[PDB]
Ligand binder design. Structure first.
Ligand SMILES: COC(=O)c1cccc2[nH]ccc12
Length: 220
């Protein structure tokens, strides 16, 4: 299938990304606390439900939350401020809490079932979020005796995510803190604006996009 793109809500950021985040890809967004990465996640979970003409893929969402950062009320706000029905938008985000790194890996594996179920329906899964990719791995695998296993488990986890993205035409979006992924680094700009910098993309120029966080989520 042709690569689809989901608008981030920001024209500036979309331009930097070549149109939006891609299906058949893992977009990995880095940032310190308050960077906007989770706000971007919340915005994408609404945007993807729109028709292509409005920046979406008429899709549903699966959301794996490792540190209790998903806010249903924020989804409702973004949905309503963008003219959608907040209750409908929430119903199409399948939520899972991951309690530890093993569980997180299992949740990605088990996600394939729902993906298959929805595949040839009116609302196929088009966005799979892991927020965040590494919090559990960082907590559980301490020091150098644990590095080898941490990297191997993380590598397998990313491989599983890649397979789902490619096989089922899904945009995978993961957050992190400092191929195989498209890496975007968020930082604070001036006057409460945020800045995204794209780094090491094989076929997109490096660059920056300035964006705002509003009642609509992310926008210029
Ligand atoms: C209701 O949401 C789920 O069941 C779910 C969401 C994200 C990943 C998942 N993996 C298995 C179930 C599941």
């Amino acid at each position: 299938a042709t690569i689809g793109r989901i608008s981030t809500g920001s024209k500036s950021l979309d331009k930097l990304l070549g149109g939006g985040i891609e299906t058949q890809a893992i977009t990995e967004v880095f940032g310190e606390f308050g960077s906007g990465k989770t706000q971007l996640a919340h915005t994408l979970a609404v945007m993807v439900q729109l028709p292509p003409e409005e920046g979406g893929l008429n899709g549903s969402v699966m959301w794996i939350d490792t540190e209790n950062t998903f806010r249903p009320e924020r989804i409702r706000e973004i949905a309503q401020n963008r003219g959608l029905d907040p209750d409908e938008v929430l119903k199409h985000i399948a939520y899972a809490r991951a309690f530890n790194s093993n569980h997180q890996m299992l949740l990605v594996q088990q996600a394939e079932d729902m993906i298959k179920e929805l595949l040839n329906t009116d609302r196929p899964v088009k966005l799979l979020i892991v927020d965040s990719l590494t919090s559990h791995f960082r907590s559980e695998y301490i020091g150098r005796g644990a590095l080898a296993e941490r990297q191997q488990k993380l590598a397998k986890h990313l491989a599983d995510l890649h397979r789902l993205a490619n096989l089922y035409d899904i945009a995978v979006f993961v957050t992190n803190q400092v191929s195989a992924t498209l890496r975007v680094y968020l930082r604070k700009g001036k006057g409460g604006k945020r800045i995204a910098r794209l780094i090491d993309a094989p076929h997109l120029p490096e660059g920056e996009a300035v964006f705002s966080i509003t009642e609509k989520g992310i926008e210029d």
